[PDB]
Design an enzyme around this catalytic site. Structure first.
Site, PDB file in Angstrom:
ATOM      1  CB  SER A  15      19.645  47.383  42.317  1.00  0.00           C
ATOM      2  OG  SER A  15      19.371  47.719  43.663  1.00  0.00           O
ATOM      3  CD  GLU A  65      21.419  40.387  45.647  1.00  0.00           C
ATOM      4  OE1 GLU A  65      21.950  41.515  45.650  1.00  0.00           O
ATOM      5  OE2 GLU A  65      20.703  39.964  44.712  1.00  0.00           O
ATOM      6  CG  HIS A 125      22.857  45.069  46.257  1.00  0.00           C
ATOM      7  ND1 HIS A 125      21.876  44.339  45.625  1.00  0.00           N
ATOM      8  CD2 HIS A 125      22.620  46.365  45.946  1.00  0.00           C
ATOM      9  CE1 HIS A 125      21.092  45.155  44.944  1.00  0.00           C
ATOM     10  NE2 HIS A 125      21.521  46.391  45.123  1.00  0.00           N
TER      11      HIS A 125
END
Lengths: 494, 496, 493, 498
Positions: B194, B310, B407
């Site tokens: 990230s 995601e 995610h």
């Protein structure tokens, strides 16, 4: 790892050898300047019985913190004592007669030591088959306080005690370097910043004559830091007032603890308050005056600067990254005085970016480039062999603001890029190793043959007035001719 | 049993703990605390200490707002926090040896996270792979990424990237001291997720970081993620300062403000990604993808990837993405893609199943993650760097399977931290996850050690290239798919 | 060589490791016994901040130079200071809980140090996976002057300060040895000569009752050197007069330089005047009496002597080589007094060679073998597990006159034959390495298991009153049963 | 081109000299000076010293009488002498390394000689063989070998063998410190000539010396050479004490007597070999040849040999060996072989050429040298030790060639010191001597190095065994002779004198 014992005129010393290189640390070249010897010219050390330990570095001269470089680096405060007159030797073997490289460290005559790991001579010795000596000289008030007016003719030369220590170290080398595998007749002295200023002074000093045949001046010259007898006396008075010592009081002078001298020097404020003095004895005339007269017609000189010398000081003063003009003009006027106006106008036009970025070459020129070129030009006119260089490799640290800053070339010349803390200064780009080698071997070649040319470098012409050729140390090394033509003219015209 | 292991850094001795199999040092300082005059300034090496420093406890995390999106699924206990946060943690088999080193840059949108989060525990990696694992903290939020150059002048040059300078400083510490912990400084791999993978992308671009690592892994992030222009950063900086109550040029109020107030000032801006690395001209000279295309990282080898679905995680924060068609759903899309959303929404509308918002989630995923990933992968292939690409397809069953391969799901698989507290709470308890975890785990170990992620558990993993665009798919049955985003690649190229 | 840092209760210490073994030297186990602390029991050392250097040996206790072994082998003079209370540790790794071997050096309570290279613990640690500790204790007047009568009850225990130093080191071991990889519950104490006498005293001393589980006594016992409070007070008087410190003058006692105590002790003439004292406090009873009461019924003991113990003293005195009878009778007469006459002819008849050669076993028995056998017999009666040995390897140095002399077994036990000066003592015959290995591993096995049995050695029965089995360490090791049977009767009769 | 080299022994630092190729340390003390209370006592390690001790000059030689025959043959002047004589000298290529070591024990009938003799210079051995060479001094004459056990009692036990204890002390020093000079203490070869070889023969027998060396070379000497029974030594000791004016038991006069007076007291005894090692029971427990036969040196490898005409050198002392009178010759033969003289005189009178005395010289050569050689060589073969045998046949032309391959001729050949001062007077100036020297020089080097004296210069040299009795013959054309003394071996065996 094994012990190697060598006998100097004063006694035996015990060093260490890995087989390839031997090192002796903390060898005394003079009697400790304590008690009556404090504020006095250096004296030969007392002979000793037995095998003296040379496995440990001697203490450094008493100094203030000066963390500018040390804060970026992880470097520790140096162990310090007034008893500091020691040198360290790196040689392949005590057998032989190699060229000798004697290093004089910088630090504005106030800080530094020969014991700093960036100055380690192992690589020079191994690669070049040479003997390397690094040394300590008295710094600060103990080194450069001009006490002639205050305390009378008993303290003649007190303004140049640090230089007298360097000369004593040079005399020791001539007498004992043979026992360590060196040739006393093939001695090169090299230094950076105040160390290069010391080399510039030694060219002029009559006592140092014959003690060296070749000299390298890195980011410094005789123009850098020398003070007149009058100005030095005024500085000495201010220090004495901070020290609390009245003129003529012998006791109070010796009784003061060494740290108090350091604190008194620091209380005077920032800059270079103490330096070598044109006293008439040790230094009879200005170093630049002696150069013009051919005092160094016999000495061969390699002189140079880094491309962005003054950028290092942008760490202690961020105005150099800004476009504020009142503060920048004030800083420029401090150095160049009345010529500040025209030169600021000249430098503002050239280059790109912020005003500070465009004004940094001005400061570099005033402080470093000017003394370098005058040194090179004086030697060229008298016919001495001279070579000029510019160090252009840039460190990317801190956003690349430093560029090719002051003192960056030290790990490159010594090939000490891997030594503790260096890569924090230089960065960790793999290209730096090749640049170091190109510079390292050139310093070796000059010490050995008097010519810095080696197969790695392109053809390096001697610096002369007509071509003004200057070797540029970069990723791709090249020779540039009259690179300072424009600035050199305007500085003449302004 | 647990016994003390004392190791000496250049700055001093530190006391870790060992069970015999793995040693751990927690809370090792790599810089002076960035407090007082050092606040809003680049990191400096720490003051040396005499004696033995305790390294049995984690250091405090950077002052941050609460993130209970991630915390509600996780145990999510509030992290202990202090402005003095510059600490890193080391897991190694033994202080004797010279193993490859894996350095982790945690995510959290440049606002949250710490190296101390239990899913980042390096014990399993060190045990399985015979590597040294380092997790670190960097300054977060305004204290890390406030662009104060215009407001307060040149004393704060690089203030937009102080968090990045901390990551560089941690790597300098590793290069300096990792040998005493059993690591090889010449074999360093950096990996992040990230904002951590966005930080890795900047580090590939930043010239100060060059040489500090030889290999990099970018998970659910790229150099495009969160980076701001100087102009965009100064405008955000102006907004932050007003909420804080600091007038421009007031240096006292800048230093006087409590660290919590800075965190709240950033929170007052609203949700999103307000702070990130800045193209300030110095620390980051150009945009990371521009540097990548120019061959800034031609020597570095890269493993880059994304999870299948995601953006679905962020649909937990906003229902609209699971809800029916809305003008707002178009607005959410156009904010990321501007003019192109008109055409993109129609192409995405036809593709997939479920509500229009659910069908629009792949659009957001491609914009935020897939695009930079493929751009990063294409850049290294063109400049000749070794590159491998992956897609994480394991799906969590929580919340009815709306999250899918969302995610941050792949992290405990990478670290083999599935039994860390609460992990099965996120991932589910399917017994198949262990094999997928081992599959990713060993490939990360392999890449750090040998520079090639292929291992016997996995099928043949071809290097990513421009022709085949080969992508390893981590699934219950791992497979290699060639050009899996081909269709989307053309449509995104067709409009902006 | 790389640094290894360990944290003691008092502070951190910096040692050195080759990978296989770590060593810490000069670790202070007590406050320096200087100034007011001189002639006082040891006190815990002051805690320190920072990392203390443990790469160099601490100074040895102030002692006269005794060049008996040192002249033959070339040993240099020990660096000395009154602050001598330091110990040295050898361990494979600070991680672990290994058996611990604590060495008490000999030297007649007057000389020696734990730092002597024959006492290097590297080989024991490497071979046996054990922690080895060697230590210094206060020697001479500073250690064993009985000043209770002279200076009053403020100086209670002054006759046994050296023993209190050893106890403090063992207490330190219990507390801190865990940090160095040792297990404080598996501690064996071993010593030679006066060091074995100290072990004998430690078995009797109640303060030591928990500090050790096993003991090895090499060429020494509790019968060796212990003095009564009365005789010790008389020795103290002679020394004080040589010192020039009048009894009850505290300033003079603390004022005197440490060297002057060594000279005053040496000026008392030849032989050893100082040893442990049965003062009633530190040592309540005679060590041999305590053994008879079963005070050490719990401890397992390995006790032994060398075949030709007294031959070493011949290097100082030539009469032992000689057949002169007046001189030999006088020397024998010094040890055994009125029984000398009968014993001289028992020993004159047996054996061959010169009269001195035939009389040397007589002295060996009186000084060493007697205390060994009494110790073994006492432990056997009370049921403690006990093993007995005799060291028969002979050194060929100086024409073979030394034979299996006193202290010869030290480098064999420690496997330090290659250490500086050892080969001058033992000679350079290649057979010595196997004998050393046999002895070395047997000492390891005893420290580890409480049984000295190992595969190199033949079957080694525990010493009992019935069989009296004694293991004989030679080129070919064998078990001899009741080897001193003849001598036991004649000395009894 | 000459520079100082400082090396550190256990006792202190010493300064040698180097030309680049070889370093030399001279006058290094290996024991405390045996003067005052240390006189008539075994050697002790030297006192440690601080600082750098000069090792550029040779130490003084042991107090000795003059050797006129050696002086007339060789130019060297009388040696500097002092009772403080315990010194050794080291030649090494470099202090770095672990080379094989050659330790030399000089001859001279236990009364004369020194390690400092220029023919013993180890430079050539060091440069050619990559070895470290040590020459040493040991106490000679009365100070070294007076058996004082009966006269003054057990304080002087082993006094009959103090010279041997000095040799052991030097080997202990080598074991201790030779590493600092570039040598390997585990690969040490001891070699000597004449009484030096007799010392080597005793060192094989002495249990204290066991392990201090792995290989031994015995040139013109053996364990039989000069060794005396305790009784004979006590008798000689009494004569020495009488001439000295020292009564038995007078410790004052014993220590007070000047060292030169001891040399004169031995000289007053007359010519011959009055002093030697003593079978005292301690230092030497048994006769060296007795210990050899029992396998005391089964581990040691031995190269043993003699010169072709050993005893001929001594005819330059006593001209009767050139004369033809039977009475004088018979007396001299009877002194060595006793009752068996008549059988051998008749054996030898027929054999050979020239006058009867010249024909009787081989008799003396066999009794003194050849017999002990074969006994030593035979003993090692039986116990299984590796042994090689040689005979030196090169002849000197001096004095009309009457000397032939005489005693001590082989020394400059082994050391390759033909060029050092005075050598050409002894050996002659034939250009052929260089090749024979190289043959021996390299063979000695090889033996120290590999334990086999074989090198490419020499023909194939088989090991000595009892069947073939193979002997390498060093001549202008080197050759191997098998059982060259067979004839004499049988007669001397029949004679009851061998």
């Amino acid at each position: 790892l094994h012990d190697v014992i060598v006998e100097t005129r004063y006694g035996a010393v015990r060093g260490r050898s890995d087989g390839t290189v031997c090192v002796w640390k903390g060898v005394p070249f003079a009697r400790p300047p304590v008690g009556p010897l404090r504020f006095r010219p250096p004296e030969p050390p007392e002979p000793w019985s037995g095998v003296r330990d040379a496995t440990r570095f001697g203490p450094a001269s008493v100094q203030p913190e000066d963390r500018l470089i040390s804060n970026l680096t992880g470097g520790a405060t140096l162990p310090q004592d007034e008893d500091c007159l020691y040198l360290n030797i790196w040689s392949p073997s005590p057998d032989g007669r190699r060229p000798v490289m004697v290093w004089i460290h910088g630090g504005a005559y106030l800080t530094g030591a020969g014991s700093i790991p960036w100055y380690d001579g192992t690589a020079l010795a191994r690669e070049g088959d040479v003997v390397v000596v690094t040394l300590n000289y008295r710094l600060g008030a103990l080194g450069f306080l001009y006490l002639e007016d205050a305390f009378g003719p008993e303290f003649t030369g007190s303004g140049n005690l640090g230089i007298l220590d360097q000369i004593a170290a040079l005399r020791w080398v001539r007498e004992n370097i043979a026992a360590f595998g060196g040739d006393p007749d093939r001695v090169t002295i090299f230094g950076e910043s105040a160390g290069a200023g010391s080399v510039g002074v030694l060219l002029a000093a009559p006592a140092a004559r014959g003690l060296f045949h070749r000299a390298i001046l890195q980011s410094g010259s005789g123009a850098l830091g020398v003070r007149t007898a009058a100005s030095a006396a005024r500085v000495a008075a201010r220090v004495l007032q901070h020290a609390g010592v009245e003129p003529g009081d012998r006791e109070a002078l010796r009784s003061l603890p060494a740290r108090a001298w350091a604190n008194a020097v620091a209380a005077l404020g920032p800059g270079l308050p103490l330096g070598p003095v044109v006293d008439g004895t040790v230094l009879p005339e200005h170093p630049m005056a002696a150069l013009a007269r051919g005092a160094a017609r016999d000495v061969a000189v390699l002189v140079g600067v880094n491309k962005d010398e003054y950028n290092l000081f942008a760490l202690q003063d961020p105005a150099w990254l800004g476009d504020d003009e009142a503060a920048l003009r004030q800083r420029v006027e401090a150095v160049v005085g009345p010529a500040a106006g025209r030169l600021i106008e000249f430098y503002r036009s050239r280059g790109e970016g912020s005003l500070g970025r465009r004004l940094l070459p001005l400061m570099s020129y005033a402080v470093f480039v000017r003394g370098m070129l005058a040194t090179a030009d004086a030697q060229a006119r008298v016919g001495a062999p001279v070579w000029a260089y510019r160090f252009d490799f840039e460190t990317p640290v801190l956003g690349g603001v430093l560029g090719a800053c002051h003192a960056l070339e030290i790990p490159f010349v010594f090939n000490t890029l891997d030594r503790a803390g260096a890569d924090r200064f230089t960065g960790t780009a793999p290209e730096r190793y090749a640049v170091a080698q190109a510079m390292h071997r050139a310093w070796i070649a000059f010490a050995r043959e008097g010519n810095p040319q080696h197969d790695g470098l392109p053809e390096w012409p001697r610096y002369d007035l007509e071509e003004r050729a200057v070797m540029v140390f970069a990723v791709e090394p090249r020779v540039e001719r009259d690179p300072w033509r424009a600035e050199r003219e305007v500085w003449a015209a302004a």
